[PDB]
Amino acid sequence: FETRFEKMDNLLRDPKSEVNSDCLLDGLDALVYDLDFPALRKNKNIDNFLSRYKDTINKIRDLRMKAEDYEVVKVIGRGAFGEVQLVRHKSTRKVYAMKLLSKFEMIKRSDSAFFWEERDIMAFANSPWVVQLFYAFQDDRYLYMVMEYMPGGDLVNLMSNYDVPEKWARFYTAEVVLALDAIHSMGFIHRDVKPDNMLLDKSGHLKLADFGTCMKMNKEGMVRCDTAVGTPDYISPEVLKSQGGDGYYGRECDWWSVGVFLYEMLVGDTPFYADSLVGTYSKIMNHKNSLTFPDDNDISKEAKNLICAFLTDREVRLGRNGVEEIKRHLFFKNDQWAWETLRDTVAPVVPDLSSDIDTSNFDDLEEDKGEEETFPIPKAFVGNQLPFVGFTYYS
Amino acid sequence: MSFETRFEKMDNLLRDPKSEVNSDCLLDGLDALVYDLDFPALRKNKNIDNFLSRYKDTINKIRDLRMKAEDYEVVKVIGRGAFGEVQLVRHKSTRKVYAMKLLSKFEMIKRSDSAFFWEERDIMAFANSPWVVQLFYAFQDDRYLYMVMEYMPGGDLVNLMSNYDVPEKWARFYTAEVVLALDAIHSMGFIHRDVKPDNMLLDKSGHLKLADFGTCMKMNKEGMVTPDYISPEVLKYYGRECDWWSVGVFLYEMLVGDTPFYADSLVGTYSKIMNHKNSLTISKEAKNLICAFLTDLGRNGVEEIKRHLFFKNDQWAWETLRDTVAPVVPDLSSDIDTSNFDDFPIPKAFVGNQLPFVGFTYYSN
Ligand SMILES: CN(C)[C@H]1CCc2nc(NC(=O)c3cccc([C@H]4CCCN4C(=O)Nc4cccc(C#N)c4)c3)sc2C1
Ligand SMILES: CN(C)[C@H]1CCc2nc(NC(=O)c3cccc([C@H]4CCCN4C(=O)Nc4cccc(C#N)c4)c3)sc2C1
């Protein structure tokens, strides 16, 4: 009684806990979803449980956060397992960006663990470099992530809408460096650094948005991965080389992607662009001969040096000896801003916003996903809702 | 509905001890899920393996933290029922003395009885009456259901009737205490259906308290719902009047020594109850009350029972009856005195044997 009890109360209250109040309700909720089928109901035990808990769980479902509580303005983005839509909470009238993740497409493949790091990072980062997660909830079909809306859009949109000069390229590269260092200080390697993940707020300042590929570093700041992760153009040779045996890499791989970002910002095209996706693979592996710069150059000596310093073999890459090695590069030596007060200074592009639901910085995309597949009626207990138990979070 | 009213209502649902979805009941679900899924055949499923790898360790941590059978030192077995036993226990940490009731989950699953304990749990835990044996803690493991209740050192009325030739002065007291005790159960919206001296327990003071509530049933619309105390209407819909029949059966056995329908053959008893007009064979008002309950009294209310000439006495009053001196006050030497007490298969697929027990865990305060 005195020896142990105090610890149990903390485990139920703690937001970082795996067995807190909201996570335990997820278990009861998942159990009802996975058992309520005629074939399964034949079992006296399964029928005994559902007859006692179906009515109260339906009462729970109505009380706790649901997709119905949010009014969808428009679809602003789309990923592999879902879509990002601009939403307004019906009661509070607060504007958010809601990320949906298809439980079907997640179960169909095997990806049912990637969201845990993303959820943890966004919800407990408390950094102006990470897109904040206010609420996380779920139903039988999706995983919902209620995050802060970034009205300035992504860097892909900025690079297509503007001929980015070196003064702007210096700002956005430095912001990415400080943003990645915040992720590194949290003990993570991003593994998917690209302009699609770099989002801008109402002020026009950078924030990292997707953390699905994030992996916790060991005591040596290293990681072991048998399967390569990222995007064909921004992938580093060491991560691209991943296979069962030699898949050993640290935080240096994220700095490669920074150089890939800087090249695309100043040139207009990705450094290892090929018309065939296999052609890109060979170009990255042969960076010693593939990395060229167009004959016409308005871009500085120090810009090409930082690009080439990042775009080298893992061992000779810049940033191997910490972030201070990057911060001290001649390319970042300017007069307009300082490393410690960079986010406090005026951004190059400040979004001209008319309303709280302004989507000018987001390109229109096909709203209809057709007809999404739903799990077939099981003949026995499969428990498709089990890998999602504990996802619900509140702030 | 809505915000923050829906959040407020949710917070109450998690804190409320009477709630089916409170903190302690939700942990039972997660705990049952681990017990029912952790098997090699079931672990083959990627989803079942994903859940177990993520929650097995923390659930083991919770099992150690939460109340368990190991926390109690068993003094001796004081009783035994169909699906378990009642044992006198001492909590290892607090050193507090209780009476612990065990209920075999295997025996409960083997038959079909997996709902009878819910009424008993609800009554004992939320009665807050000096007529009901209080339930302090309710917990469970993969094998049993545990009920940590208050110890009744005076024993049962069966032991009293065998150890004493109960006079009318004593019979008047114990019958009246049963009446007030049953009225408390009725006011809670429950029908006992098995009122017998085996269920009537006495405290350190020597005052009555109802104990076994396995046979209880919650009232429907307004007030509608093993041997020998059974009424003809139950034996073959009825109200609270069936419990009053058993009161008369108790009073007859207290004064005569034998039950009014006692038969050498158990089938003979069944026929005797149905023919109570001819089967029913030392005071005038005592016999008048036995015949009053043994009909087809208590039809309207409890006041008609209270106003009977048999209850008219000089020694006690209905409102202060439990405050007066009891006829038999137990002579107790220690806090663990027992003088008044006479001495599963590995599934090939998801069966979920722990599911009918989810929500049983309770902690008062
Ligand atoms: C292979 N395995 C191991 C896994 C590796 C990690 C991973 N991540 C996935 N992720 C997705 O399925 C997904 C769904 C919707 C949107 C987005 C992004 C990509 C397009 C925009 N976006 C995004 O998150 N935007 C966002 C985020 C935050 C705020 C705002 C705003 N305003 C916008 C991603 S699927 C998957 C498989
Ligand atoms: C057929 N169906 C529908 C169900 C009808 C209701 C029912 N009840 C059962 N009940 C049991 O299995 C059981 C287990 C242990 C003890 C006791 C009692 C019977 C002997 C004493 N006792 C008891 O509860 N004593 C008690 C209680 C409280 C405090 C103290 C003390 N001190 C002592 C009963 S099995 C069952 C089947």
Short mmCIF file of N, CA and C and ligand atoms in Angstrom, two decimals, chain B residues 78 80-86 99 101 103 113 116 133 149-152 211-212 214-215 341, ligand 2:
data_model
loop_
_atom_site.label_atom_id
_atom_site.label_comp_id
_atom_site.label_asym_id
_atom_site.label_seq_id
_atom_site.Cartn_x
_atom_site.Cartn_y
_atom_site.Cartn_z
N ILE B 78 -12.73 -19.92 6.73
CA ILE B 78 -13.90 -19.80 7.62
C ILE B 78 -15.22 -20.22 6.95
N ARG B 80 -17.04 -21.94 2.85
CA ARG B 80 -16.90 -22.53 1.51
C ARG B 80 -18.24 -22.59 0.79
N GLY B 81 -18.25 -22.09 -0.44
CA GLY B 81 -19.42 -22.09 -1.31
C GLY B 81 -19.23 -22.99 -2.52
N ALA B 82 -20.10 -22.83 -3.53
CA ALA B 82 -20.06 -23.62 -4.76
C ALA B 82 -18.85 -23.35 -5.65
N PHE B 83 -18.51 -22.06 -5.86
CA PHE B 83 -17.39 -21.66 -6.72
C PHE B 83 -16.16 -21.12 -5.98
N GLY B 84 -16.13 -21.25 -4.66
CA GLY B 84 -14.99 -20.78 -3.89
C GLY B 84 -15.06 -20.98 -2.39
N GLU B 85 -14.22 -20.21 -1.67
CA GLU B 85 -14.09 -20.26 -0.22
C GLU B 85 -13.88 -18.87 0.38
N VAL B 86 -14.34 -18.69 1.63
CA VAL B 86 -14.16 -17.46 2.40
C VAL B 86 -13.09 -17.73 3.44
N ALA B 99 -12.14 -10.47 5.73
CA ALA B 99 -12.69 -11.75 5.30
C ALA B 99 -12.63 -11.71 3.76
N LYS B 101 -13.23 -13.45 0.06
CA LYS B 101 -14.02 -14.41 -0.71
C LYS B 101 -13.33 -14.64 -2.05
N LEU B 103 -13.37 -16.69 -5.83
CA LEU B 103 -14.29 -17.27 -6.81
C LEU B 103 -13.51 -17.80 -8.00
N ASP B 113 -22.02 -19.66 -15.21
CA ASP B 113 -22.15 -18.64 -14.17
C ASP B 113 -20.97 -17.68 -14.22
N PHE B 116 -23.43 -13.63 -11.77
CA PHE B 116 -24.00 -13.62 -10.42
C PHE B 116 -23.28 -12.67 -9.43
N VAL B 133 -22.74 -6.25 4.75
CA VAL B 133 -21.30 -6.51 4.94
C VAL B 133 -20.57 -5.68 3.87
N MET B 149 -13.78 -8.15 2.16
CA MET B 149 -14.92 -7.66 2.94
C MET B 149 -14.61 -7.58 4.43
N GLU B 150 -15.51 -6.93 5.21
CA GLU B 150 -15.35 -6.83 6.67
C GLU B 150 -15.62 -8.17 7.33
N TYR B 151 -14.78 -8.53 8.30
CA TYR B 151 -14.91 -9.78 9.03
C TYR B 151 -16.04 -9.68 10.06
N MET B 152 -16.88 -10.72 10.11
CA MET B 152 -18.00 -10.82 11.04
C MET B 152 -17.61 -11.85 12.12
N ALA B 211 -24.90 -11.10 4.28
CA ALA B 211 -23.61 -11.37 3.66
C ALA B 211 -23.65 -11.95 2.23
N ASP B 212 -24.16 -13.18 2.04
CA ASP B 212 -24.16 -13.79 0.70
C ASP B 212 -25.23 -13.15 -0.20
N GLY B 214 -25.15 -13.59 -3.86
CA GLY B 214 -25.01 -14.20 -5.18
C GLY B 214 -26.32 -14.40 -5.92
N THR B 215 -27.39 -14.64 -5.16
CA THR B 215 -28.76 -14.89 -5.64
C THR B 215 -29.58 -13.61 -5.91
N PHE B 341 -16.84 -19.81 14.21
CA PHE B 341 -16.79 -20.46 12.90
C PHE B 341 -16.29 -21.89 13.02
C1 LIG C 2 -26.50 -20.86 -9.87
N1 LIG C 2 -25.97 -19.50 -10.12
C2 LIG C 2 -26.99 -18.62 -10.73
C3 LIG C 2 -25.19 -18.86 -9.03
C4 LIG C 2 -26.08 -18.42 -7.85
C5 LIG C 2 -25.29 -17.52 -6.89
C6 LIG C 2 -23.97 -18.18 -6.52
N2 LIG C 2 -23.24 -17.84 -5.47
C7 LIG C 2 -22.12 -18.46 -5.28
N3 LIG C 2 -21.26 -18.18 -4.22
C8 LIG C 2 -20.10 -18.83 -3.93
O1 LIG C 2 -19.52 -19.53 -4.74
C9 LIG C 2 -19.55 -18.68 -2.56
C10 LIG C 2 -18.17 -18.80 -2.32
C11 LIG C 2 -17.69 -18.67 -1.02
C12 LIG C 2 -18.58 -18.43 0.03
C13 LIG C 2 -19.95 -18.30 -0.19
C14 LIG C 2 -20.95 -18.05 0.92
C15 LIG C 2 -21.65 -19.36 1.33
C16 LIG C 2 -20.77 -19.85 2.51
C17 LIG C 2 -20.34 -18.52 3.19
N4 LIG C 2 -20.40 -17.45 2.16
C18 LIG C 2 -20.06 -16.14 2.36
O2 LIG C 2 -20.17 -15.34 1.45
N5 LIG C 2 -19.60 -15.76 3.60
C19 LIG C 2 -19.19 -14.49 4.05
C20 LIG C 2 -19.53 -13.29 3.40
C21 LIG C 2 -19.14 -12.05 3.91
C22 LIG C 2 -18.40 -11.98 5.08
C23 LIG C 2 -18.06 -13.17 5.76
C24 LIG C 2 -17.31 -13.09 6.97
N6 LIG C 2 -16.72 -13.03 7.94
C25 LIG C 2 -18.47 -14.41 5.25
C26 LIG C 2 -20.42 -18.43 -1.49
S1 LIG C 2 -21.91 -19.63 -6.52
C27 LIG C 2 -23.42 -19.16 -7.28
C28 LIG C 2 -24.02 -19.74 -8.55
#
